[PDB]
Amino acid sequence: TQQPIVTGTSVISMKYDNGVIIAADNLGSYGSLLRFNGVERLIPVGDNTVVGISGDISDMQHIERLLKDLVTENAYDNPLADAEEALEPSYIFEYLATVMYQRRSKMNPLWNAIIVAGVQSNGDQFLRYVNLLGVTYSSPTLATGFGAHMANPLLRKVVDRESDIPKTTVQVAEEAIVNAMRVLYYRDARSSRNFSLAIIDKNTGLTFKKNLQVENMKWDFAKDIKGYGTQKI
Amino acid sequence: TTIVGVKFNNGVVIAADTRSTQGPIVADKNCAKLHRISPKIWCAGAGTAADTEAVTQLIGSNIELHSLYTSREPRVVSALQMLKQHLFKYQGHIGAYLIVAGVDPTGSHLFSIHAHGSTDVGYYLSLGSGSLAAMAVLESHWKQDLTKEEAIKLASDAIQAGIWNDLGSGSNVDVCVMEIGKDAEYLRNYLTPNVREEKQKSYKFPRGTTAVLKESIVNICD
Amino acid sequence: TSIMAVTFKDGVILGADSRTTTGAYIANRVTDKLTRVHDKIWCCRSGSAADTQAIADIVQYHLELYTSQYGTPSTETAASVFKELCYENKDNLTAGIIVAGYDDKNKGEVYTIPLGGSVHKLPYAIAGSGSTFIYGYCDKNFRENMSKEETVDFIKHSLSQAIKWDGSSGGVIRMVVLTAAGVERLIFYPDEYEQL
Amino acid sequence: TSIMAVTFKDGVILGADSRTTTGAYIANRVTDKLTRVHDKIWCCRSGSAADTQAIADIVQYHLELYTSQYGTPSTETAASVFKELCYENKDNLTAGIIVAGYDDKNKGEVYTIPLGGSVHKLPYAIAGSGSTFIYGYCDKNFRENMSKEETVDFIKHSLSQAIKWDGSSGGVIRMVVLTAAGVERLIFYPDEYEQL
Amino acid sequence: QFNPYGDNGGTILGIAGEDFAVLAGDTRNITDYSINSRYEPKVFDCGDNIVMSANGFAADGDALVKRFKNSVKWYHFDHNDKKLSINSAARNIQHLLYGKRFFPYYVHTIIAGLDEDGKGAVYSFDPVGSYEREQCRAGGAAASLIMPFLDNQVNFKNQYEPGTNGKVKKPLKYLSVEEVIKLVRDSFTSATERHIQVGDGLEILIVTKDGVRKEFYELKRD
Amino acid sequence: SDPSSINGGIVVAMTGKDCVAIACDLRLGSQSLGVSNKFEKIFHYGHVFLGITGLATDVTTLNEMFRYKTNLYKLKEERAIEPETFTQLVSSSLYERRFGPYFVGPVVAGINSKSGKPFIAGFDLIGCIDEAKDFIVSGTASDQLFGMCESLYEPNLEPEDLFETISQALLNAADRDALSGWGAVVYIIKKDEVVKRYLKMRQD
Amino acid sequence: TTTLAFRFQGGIIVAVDSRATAGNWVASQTVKKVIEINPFLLGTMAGCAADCQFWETWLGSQCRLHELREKERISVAAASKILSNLVYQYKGAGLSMGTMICGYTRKEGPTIYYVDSDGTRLKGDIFCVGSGQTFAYGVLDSNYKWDLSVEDALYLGKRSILAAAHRDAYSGGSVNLYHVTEDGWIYHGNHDVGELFWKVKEEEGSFNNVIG
Amino acid sequence: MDIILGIRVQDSVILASSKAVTRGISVLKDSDDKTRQLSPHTLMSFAGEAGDTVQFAEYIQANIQLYSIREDYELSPQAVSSFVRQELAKSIRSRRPYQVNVLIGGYDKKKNKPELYQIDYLGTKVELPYGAHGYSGFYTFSLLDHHYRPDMTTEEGLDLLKLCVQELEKRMPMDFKGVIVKIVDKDGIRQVDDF
Amino acid sequence: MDIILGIRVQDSVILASSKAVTRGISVLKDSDDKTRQLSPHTLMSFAGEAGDTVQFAEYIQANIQLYSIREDYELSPQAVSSFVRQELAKSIRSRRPYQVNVLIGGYDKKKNKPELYQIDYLGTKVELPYGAHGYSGFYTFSLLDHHYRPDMTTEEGLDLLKLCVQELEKRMPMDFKGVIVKIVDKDGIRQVDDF
Ligand SMILES: *[C@@](C)(CO)[C@](*)(O)[C@H](Cc1ccccc1)NC(=O)[C@H](Cc1ccc(OC)cc1)NC(=O)[C@H](C)NC(=O)CN1CCOCC1
Ligand SMILES: *[C@@](C)(CO)[C@](*)(O)[C@H](Cc1ccccc1)NC(=O)[C@H](Cc1ccc(OC)cc1)NC(=O)[C@H](C)NC(=O)CN1CCOCC1
Ligand SMILES: *[C@@](C)(CO)[C@](*)(O)[C@H](Cc1ccccc1)NC(=O)[C@H](Cc1ccc(OC)cc1)NC(=O)[C@H](C)NC(=O)CN1CCOCC1
Ligand SMILES: *[C@@](C)(CO)[C@](*)(O)[C@H](Cc1ccccc1)NC(=O)[C@H](Cc1ccc(OC)cc1)NC(=O)[C@H](C)NC(=O)CN1CCOCC1
Ligand SMILES: [Mg+2]
Ligand SMILES: [Mg+2]
Ligand SMILES: [Mg+2]
Ligand SMILES: [Mg+2]
Ligand code: NA
């Protein structure tokens, strides 16, 4: 039985025609205190997978070490470690999903919500979620925390079902993700302006973008707002 | 529930879904969450269904009497003040979360009231279980100097976000447009994107299927 | 919330953020926490939005009725009415209010009223959840008899830090200037204050 | 507690107050919260005195055994051992530790380990109950590549404010300077820092 | 305090014919008032002409299905590729569930297939292992809505022969696969209307001696 | 100690072509113990019918209360109360007890004598009106009734057909609820004739 | 549930209902609450369905192992005690079982043992177990005599379950009858209450509380 | 308190009520009459919380007797039962409710019919051919379902009642020290002294 | 379970034990023997938590019988009681203690004296002229304080015991369905069939 201390907020993601996009802000909250501002919550595994993690940061750092160790262990006695027998997103996910459910069953969970985004060896897009309860699900769009409430509605307007994926380009998909991150900065009290974004394409590969900022924000209309009702001045 | 309010050029528009729940069960598939306080002051309600209805009727009654007393068309701030003082008095036990809007001699207005009696002001607002789905849309597409047709679209789009993505919201979209200098138009079932598909079979029973023990004529007359 | 009120040479300035939270959700990102109870007597509200709102409305009513009978009330009088409500209903209220006003005799005055309902007259006052992070900064940087421009910078820099560290604070920085000249409303957007 | 560790040009400086409380009673007013785990690797302890003490003793033992086999450990290695204890025993510990050390290759380094057991490498770090009051001040005043004298003043002024506002903090300000030159212990009494 | 259980919603339904059996289930996955997936299958082909679904807490349901699939695999290894009969699978599942009697799998389980005489079979389980063979069974969130409908339309309960003075019951008879699928589709559309955790899509798995076939149908997405 | 599920019971109402139907079970128990198999839950005030489920003492109390109120209505108005108006009276009366409510689930059914339109409505224990074209359900087997009505119902049924549909909705829903059943009554209501039938159902 | 079993001149009668509950939700109406352990041993089920189902099937496996090892059918006493010693090991953990081990052996004769989840084990001539045990006792006790005929005893057992199925909200479905003699157990059919009630009411003239 | 039964037959209503008054581990009395005569042809038995029972019974008794004197007329059993129900229906939403369950047996002289009403402390009224309060019902209802006939005589009703008491004495955990039986018919109320 | 009594007289020990086995609102059995013979001249009655009672009694019985076979010798009542006490003294600090109270009546053949030991579930042993467990003692102890004499015969002891059962049947709330009486003397253990 735990309680989360230093926490990370929403992780959002979606599929597009050739691959997947995933994003998450760089904040490490300590309750209401916005304590740490240089936290990377997107962790690449190889050149074909990115794991986005929210929840407890100490448990996130533990998972980082497991994935780091997984790459090492896979390389052992494996001449095709950088080829046919490289780590797939589906392998990495199933490993984590096994761990998450084992820990909840021992009543000592890893207090996290995880999204594994990647591209398989056959070109298929991989996007699947797992959390502290060991609950798993997949969808064209996936998000954690506040992202589930605010991002998914926006991302589902772009890709509402499976047939909408081939029709969605990387330019359109990235635009929707960046818009969603802005909306979260407006409305999530444990979010930050700075964030990271990752694209895993079946042609261009892994593109990891750091130090992004939310921009083109609408604040001007605030100047006209007075009191809470009757106040004219 | 999912409810919104949006300001535009010459007035204000409010909208709502039409689902009513009792646990995980849908009690009413086409309920009316848009309430008339006065002819040109309408209220969208989320929370405890009976509270939103009763509190809106009570203040609407007192507003009518006030309008008759003062020989003036009622103001939105009067409804806002009366509602918030009533709700505050009951310390949140009357679970009404309202979006109050309307036009009056002062202009066009848009407010929100919480159950505990706190009021907000804004150009676009959303309340209820699907308020986060709706506000995501409003924050994405809202802009200054909206037209009437643009505001109705934005409002109904915000409600749709709740209908599809929130389990506490569903069925149809109701709208009410309050423009300055015009009558307020109440658009009941403005959108109906959740029509039930034809059933595969008719379950009309053969007459005599049900076993009966007694029969009798009931007297309803005097 | 992060709120503050600072006296200076020509009068007093009130300052506040614009964030209203229901948990970790921001219900309103453009809130006006600076409220008028009289021409040149304003207050900063922190705590329960419903409670502070109801109190400010009653005080506005009392001071309007005071003005009708006895003329313009003092800032001390306004603070006394706030206190009386906050103290006598302390078991049912969660309101931390800063009262600030401008007389011509007494110039700028600031009174802070914490949870208990006690009154404290000060040169400057800070309150709200985000005030904890700027006690050190505000104490080191505050000076008496500052100019208008210095006081605006003091409040801007202070609330900037409070907003930076407090998740319950954010949005725009609203300010209200109270002098003999009149009442001036100021606003400052994230793109400006964030990179101070 | 109020504690902090700050990197600078020549290395790193650790700083702390000297107050130990059992409720509102000050059990020890001359506490030494700066503890040596290795020649030039020290830590600042906040939280449970018993827990942080037991941890530091185990870490000192591990690094002594490390040195016997593999030579001088890095500051990162020291922080890793702290983390491992704090993370794996998070349900039974209340320890907020700042680890600071000086390598000749890596120069001054600071790692903070909050309650959860997470590790965060930073330019400077603040912790303890009194740190809340100086987030604003420290962010505005910290600069990279400061001198020794500037860094001492930064810590002195910062902890001065933390002590001023936090009742759980007080007494003297102890500091430990970690450079290539060696290890220097500093102390500052109330009569000096109070009137800054 | 940490709560190890959750509710992922949805609902499932199994009907047995003379020479076939169906096991249906909606494809919606939820937590609280949010939708996680609109298409997340929970009816699986487990081999040996057995289909299985464990509805309730998805993590427990996936774990159970995974364990049973693995049980079938080792049954082949240990008993010379013998086919696991539906009655033997049921008993095996009881032991899987009861093994966690004091820390249960929060799922209502249903399996379907053909018995050793070639006739359609449906077995249903409680969360701790009690099981029973039936012609009909609904499980999950909307089981209370669907089940009485099946009692009426599959086992002809409360239906008497017209003109017999409620003395002669409507005779029991097997249904065609075409009639059964009509009942499944009508059952799920009705359940989708009044239960917020049910919707999005419907996936049916039909089992005959020829193997396992699938059918998919859209459901309302509100 | 959940007032709504001590005594048990169900009520369902449906609309047809120029007709309405309202039905109820006959059980009254004290949790597991069945006490009475004659406890009817449908009452009428003129041509307006009211069914009430929930705590039996409140069911009896409300009947007596609405009889009281409709009798005075008739004396002063010099006419029988209509379903739409009665529905509003029920809502008022229930919300009057907002913070100490009657633990009931009432259902109004009837035909407007002026317009001829069939009318049904349902309420929560505090007064929220639930108007419906098709059907209204109430009781301890409300989930079951929702599932039966939502599948079996079709619009514009003739009185003789509507009787079969509502009776089968009630019967099969009641058999999946432990606290409902033990007999049943169905009212078929036309513009100027009302037939009441007692159903034969399983007695367990 | 409602289960009974009584001893008489012509052996043992065993009668049970067939309802399963999940609160006020009727989970089933067609459940088997008697387990045929061997041609001479029966076991009734009441309480948690899974506990009853699982452990009484397990009991049958233990009784089979006994006759393999000892080349002799297990006694009713020994069979009941295996089960009672098992549940006593789990005492406090939360098992809910109300059982009756009924059977015939040469050394014992017709014998009934009541066994429950808190470790109680009692030999006796008459027992009624379950949520509706009291309703069954009322009819059974007031009509019971040792000298009942096989025909009358079968009916009394059937009528006692019917009585409970009627009044007890958590009992019903159908009646499953059994008769245990020196030659073993004999099944006497499944009797749906939907038809049995009206048949009994008409023929017997009882159940005057109900609207005929 | 504990056991109170009621059986309506062809021409009379028979009420049986246990004689034991227990407090703690002591039976304080074994001859207690748990009933009051409300009017010449109406009898009310009662059971429930200590003190509340008698206080309520006597309060009702006083009111019915007051009515009788005022109008020089006996209220019908139906009318008395409705009055009693309303008093309990008020009570349940009071600061301290009466925790009393009652059976009202009466003979309506205008209809020439016996009537038995069962009312619990919530104010839940039902007319019945036979009734019981408390745990008694769990045995007697099923027993009476079997043995009761609507056209029975008073003597047949007493034998039917003996069958209930015997079953209760056999299977009930507590010693209730037998019952006081009373018959209500056209000639009024009388007590059976040898039961 | 509930009522177990014991009376030591001149030449014997008499144990009375109630026959009722109640669960819930049903008396499941009215002929239950709440005792086990530990050895030819030692008898143990028991009362307490369901299941625990018999499980404990039979466990002790098995151990004493094992000792008898091993040594070809009967343990003294004092020795048996000390063994039983120690088992309960262990039990009370176990994960799940035996909630069983016992009376051990025995005839010591070496001393030619009857002996009665009262041991509660905590392992609290006392030798007594008369003993009881549960609520029974609240009536019987004072009664025996008055009527008991140390030099009484077995017949006088049975009359003294009848006086206890009568008092309990009068004042105890629950119906305990009479008692099974057993006598322990120089000739061993025998049961009184007509009580
Ligand atoms: C969405 C649907 C909430 O899920 C809306 O808020 C909706 C608002 C609404 C307004 C007017 C007309 C219809 C609908 N709210 C509800 O439908 C509401 C949900 C709700 C239930 C219980 C609550 O407090 C415990 C709060 C909100 N449903 C109801 O009010 C239903 C009709 N009534 C009840 O469930 C009965 N309540 C009475 C009050 O006390 C608890 C039980
Ligand atoms: C910051 C956010 C924290 O102190 C500010 O004080 C801010 C002040 C403010 C906000 C809006 C308008 C004027 C002034 N306070 C809030 O935003 C306030 C946070 C808060 C709520 C309740 C409190 O104790 C009762 C204390 C602080 N937010 C609200 O009041 C919002 C509108 N409502 C709720 O959270 C609903 N509450 C009602 C009270 O009970 C808990 C749920
Ligand atoms: C400041 C004072 C408070 O945050 C510091 O963190 C300081 C750190 C310190 C003190 C001495 C040496 C090195 C570092 N902490 C304390 O003074 C500490 C306060 C504290 C107590 C308990 C805590 O949770 C378990 C957290 C902080 N004081 C003590 O440890 C004193 C010596 N002992 C107690 O107060 C006894 N505790 C035992 C644990 O539970 C409650 C009572
Ligand atoms: C009557 C109907 C009252 O229940 C009978 O006792 C009946 C007996 C019976 C025997 C064999 C097969 C089916 C039914 N009992 C039940 O139907 C039983 C009631 C009950 C539930 C839980 C209990 O304690 C744990 C005790 C009695 N119903 C069930 O077992 C139902 C089908 N299953 C569940 O409630 C599942 N629960 C069991 C406990 O663990 C969590 C899941
Ligand atoms: Mg200090
Ligand atoms: Mg929806
Ligand atoms: Mg029943
Ligand atoms: Mg009653
Ligand atoms: Na039950």
Please provide the DSSP assignment of F44-103 as one string.
Answer: EETTEEEEEEE-HHHHHHHHHHHHHHHHHHHHHHSSPPPHHHHHHHHHHHHHTTTTS---
Cα F16 to Cα F153: distance, rounded to the nearest angstrom: 10
Q: Read off the DSSP letter of residue E160.
A: B
Contacts with I28 from chain G: Cβ below 8 Å: 114, 122, 124, 127
For B117-148, b/e burial (b = at least 16 CB within 10 A) is bbbbbbbbbbbbbbbbbbbbbbbbebeeebee
Q: Which of A109, A161, A162 lies at the smallest CB-CB distance from E2?
A: A109
CB count in 10 Å sphere of residue A204 = 11
List the single best residue of I3, I26, I165 to mutate versus H (max H Cβ within 10 A). I26
Amino acid code (one letter) for D110:
V
> Can you read off the two tokens belonging to residue F137?
């359900």
CA trace torsion I183, I187, I188, I192 (10° rounding): -30
Minimal C-alpha gap between A155 and chain E (Å):
13
How many domains is chain E partitioned into structurally?
1
Q: Which ranges of chain C would DSSP assign to H, the alpha helix?
A: 49-70, 75-88, 135-141, 148-165, 190-193
Residues of G within the annotated binding site? 49
Q: Are F6 and F47 in contact (CB under 8 A)?
A: no
Cα F120 to Cα F146: distance, rounded to the nearest angstrom: 15
- Ligand 3 center to residue D52 CA distance, Å? 9
* C74 touches ligand 2 (CB under 6 Å): no
Residue to mutate (ligand 3; options D20, D52, D98, D132; most atoms within 8 A of CB) = D20
Alpha carbon separation from G191 to A206, E161, G151, G197 (Å, rounded): 70, 20, 15, 10
* E130 touches ligand 4 (CB under 6 Å): yes
Cβ E194–F172 below 8 Å, yes or no? no
Secondary structure (H, E, C), chain I:
CCCEEEEECCCCEEEEEECCEEECCEEEECCCCCEEEEECCEEEEEEECCCHHHHHHHHHHHHHHHHHHHHCCCCCHHHHHHHHHHHHHHHCCCCCCCCEEEEEEEEECCCCEEEEEEECCCCCEEECCEEEEHHHHHHHHHHHHHHCCCCCCHHHHHHHHHHHHHHHHHHCCECCCCEEEEEEECCEEEEECCC
Contacts with G138 from chain H: Cβ below 8 Å: 138-143, 146, 167
| Dihedral sign for Cα atoms in the order D56, D57, D62, D68 | positive
Helix (H, G, I), strand (E, B), or coil: what is residue G161?
helix
* B91 touches ligand 2 (CB under 6 Å): no
- Ligand 3 center to residue D1 CA distance, Å? 8
Query: What number of residues does chain B have?
Result: 222
**Phi then psi for F76, rounded to 5 degrees?**
-90, -40
Chains D and H touch (3+ CB pairs under 8 A): no
Cβ E152–F172 below 8 Å, yes or no? yes
Q: Are E94 and E67 in contact (CB under 8 A)?
A: no
Cα H180 to Cα H193: distance, rounded to the nearest angstrom: 8
Name the residue at shortest CA distance from atom 1 of ligand 3.
D1
Cα B178 to Cα B109: distance, rounded to the nearest angstrom: 10
> Can you read off the two tokens belonging to residue I145?
């304080």
Cα A9 to Cα A112: distance, rounded to the nearest angstrom: 10
Minimal C-alpha gap between B131 and chain G (Å):
35
CB count in 10 Å sphere of residue I167 = 15
* B192 touches ligand 2 (CB under 6 Å): no
Show Cβ contacts of residue H191 under 8 Å, excluding neighbours closer than 6 positions.
Answer: H180, H181, H182, H183
Q: Are I27 and H172 in contact (CB under 8 A)?
A: yes
Q: Which fold has domain A1-233?
A: Glutamine Phosphoribosylpyrophosphate, subunit 1, domain 1 (3.60.20)
Neighbours of ion ligand 6 (CB under 5 A): B 170; E 222
Q: Which of H128, H130, H146 lies at the smallest CB-CB distance from G163?
A: H146
CB count in 10 Å sphere of residue D52 = 24
Cβ G54–E134 below 8 Å, yes or no? no
Q: Which ranges of chain F would DSSP assign to H, the alpha helix?
A: 56-77, 83-95, 142-152, 159-174
Domain assignments of chain F as residue spans, ordered by start: 1-204
Of residues G114, G103, G106, G121, the one with CA closest to residue G60: G103
- Ligand 1 center to residue H95 CA distance, Å? 29
The number of angstroms, rounded, from the C-alpha of G206 to the middle of its chain's C-alpha atoms is 24
Contacts with I29 from chain G: Cβ below 8 Å: 114, 122, 124
Amino acid code (one letter) for D88:
E
List the single best residue of B167, B192, B201, B212 to mutate versus E (max E Cβ within 10 A). B167
Cα F69 to Cα H168: distance, rounded to the nearest angstrom: 46
* B7 touches ligand 1 (CB under 6 Å): no
Q: Are H125 and F60 in contact (CB under 8 A)?
A: yes
Q: Are D100 and D60 in contact (CB under 8 A)?
A: no
Cβ E102–G53 below 8 Å, yes or no? no
**CATH match of B1-222 with 3.40.1160.10:** no
Contacts with E97 from chain G: Cβ below 8 Å: 50
Name the residue at shortest CA distance from atom 2 of ligand 4.
G1
Cβ D87–A5 below 8 Å, yes or no? no
Q: Which residues pair with I189 in a beta bridge?
A: I184
User: In order of start, what are the domains of chain D with their CATH numbers?
Assistant: 1-196 (3.60.20.10)
Q: Are D11 and D179 in contact (CB under 8 A)?
A: yes
Name the residue at shortest CA distance from atom 23 of ligand 2.
C48
Of residues H114, H184, H186, the one with CA closest to residue H150: H114
Show Cβ contacts of residue A33 under 8 Å, excluding neighbours closer than 6 positions.
Answer: C165, C166, C167, D132, D135
The number of angstroms, rounded, from the C-alpha of I140 to the middle of its chain's C-alpha atoms is 14
CB count in 10 Å sphere of residue I104 = 31
Cα A11 to Cα A127: distance, rounded to the nearest angstrom: 12
Of residues C138, D144, E11, B49, the one with CA closest to residue F122: B49
Helix (H, G, I), strand (E, B), or coil: what is residue G53?
helix
Helix (H, G, I), strand (E, B), or coil: what is residue H191?
strand
The continuous run of DSSP H or E covering F20 comes out as strand F19-25
Say yes or no: B204 contacts chain E, CB-CB below 8 A: no
* G63 touches ligand 4 (CB under 6 Å): no
For H61-90, b/e burial (b = at least 16 CB within 10 A) is beebeebeeeeeebbbbbebbbbbbebbbe
Cα G161 to Cα G128: distance, rounded to the nearest angstrom: 10
Alpha carbon separation from D29 to B88, H3, I141 (Å, rounded): 49, 74, 67
Domain assignments of chain B as residue spans, ordered by start: 1-222
Minimal C-alpha gap between B33 and chain E (Å):
18
Residue/partner pairs of C146-155 with CB below 8 Å, 24 or more apart: C146/C6, C146/C8, C146/C9, C147/C8, C147/C9, C147/C10, C148/C8, C148/C9, C148/C10, C148/C13, C148/C177, C148/C179, C150/C8, C151/C6, C151/C8, C151/C13, C152/C13, C152/C177, C152/C186, C154/C6, C155/C4, C155/C6, C155/C13, C155/C15
For D18-39, b/e burial (b = at least 16 CB within 10 A) is bbbbeeeebeeeebebbbebbe
Phi-psi bin for G172: left (phi > 0), alpha (psi -120 to 50), beta?
left
Q: What angle do CA A182, A185, A190 make, to 5 degrees?
A: 150
In the Cβ-directed half-sphere of H100, how many Cα atoms lie within 13 Å? 29
Name the residue at shortest CA distance from atom 23 of ligand 1.
B48
Neighbours of ion ligand 8 (CB under 5 A): H 120, 124
Name the residue at shortest CA distance from atom 16 of ligand 3.
D20
Q: How many CB pairs under 8 A join A and B?
A: 55
Minimal C-alpha gap between I166 and chain H (Å):
13
Contacts with A180 from chain B: Cβ below 8 Å: 136
Q: Which residues of B are catalytic?
A: 1
Of residues F13, F24, F48, F19, the one with CA closest to residue F116: F19
Measured between its terminal Cα atoms, the distance across chain D in Å is: 20
Phi-psi bin for B210: left (phi > 0), alpha (psi -120 to 50), beta?
beta
Q: Which of A1, A148, A162 lies at the smallest CB-CB distance from E2?
A: A1
> Can you read off the two tokens belonging to residue A105?
């069953």
**Phi then psi for G68, rounded to 5 degrees?**
-75, -45
Cβ G211–F32 below 8 Å, yes or no? no
Tell me which residues of chain H, numbers 50 to 109, contact chain I at a CB-CB cutoff of 8 Å.
none
Helix (H, G, I), strand (E, B), or coil: what is residue G63?
helix
Please name the method used to determine this structure. Answer: X-ray
Nearest ligand to residue H118 Cα? 8
Cα I11 to Cα E190: distance, rounded to the nearest angstrom: 83
Q: Which CATH number fits domain G1-212: 3.40.50.360, 2.70.98.40, 3.30.420.40, 3.60.20.10?
A: 3.60.20.10
Of residues B168, B70, H172, the one with CA closest to residue E195: B168
Cα G211 to Cα B26: distance, rounded to the nearest angstrom: 35
Chains B and A touch (3+ CB pairs under 8 A): yes
Of residues F123, F120, F6, the one with CA closest to residue F54: F6
Cα E198 to Cα E178: distance, rounded to the nearest angstrom: 23
Cα F90 to Cα F95: distance, rounded to the nearest angstrom: 9
Of residues G47, G40, G44, G54, the one with CA closest to residue G15: G44
Q: Are A150 and A180 in contact (CB under 8 A)?
A: yes
Cβ F168–E186 below 8 Å, yes or no? no
- Ligand 3 center to residue H195 CA distance, Å? 78
Query: What number of residues does chain E have?
Result: 222
- Ligand 7 center to residue A209 CA distance, Å? 67
* I105: containing domain: 1-195
| R_g of chain B, CA atoms, integer Å | 21
Cα E196 to Cα B130: distance, rounded to the nearest angstrom: 13
Q: Read off the DSSP letter of residue G212.
A: -
Of residues I82, I130, I78, I84, the one with CA closest to residue I106: I78
Q: Which atom of ligand 2 approaches the CA of B116 most closely?
A: 38
- Ligand 7 center to residue G161 CA distance, Å? 10
Contacts with I25 from chain H: Cβ below 8 Å: 135, 138, 171-173
The number of angstroms, rounded, from the C-alpha of D86 to the middle of its chain's C-alpha atoms is 16
* F126 touches ligand 1 (CB under 6 Å): yes
User: For the residues of C67-94, what is the DSSP string, one character each?
Assistant: HHHH-SPPHHHHHHHHHHHHHHTTTS--
The number of angstroms, rounded, from the C-alpha of B79 to the middle of its chain's C-alpha atoms is 16
For I56-66, b/e burial (b = at least 16 CB within 10 A) is bbeebbeebee
**CATH match of F1-204 with 3.60.20.10:** yes
CA trace torsion D161, D165, D169, D174 (10° rounding): 10
Helix (H, G, I), strand (E, B), or coil: what is residue F165?
helix
Chains H and I touch (3+ CB pairs under 8 A): yes
């006419």: which residue's tokens? F79
Minimal C-alpha gap between G138 and chain H (Å):
5
- Ligand 5 center to residue D190 CA distance, Å? 10
Q: Are E168 and B4 in contact (CB under 8 A)?
A: no
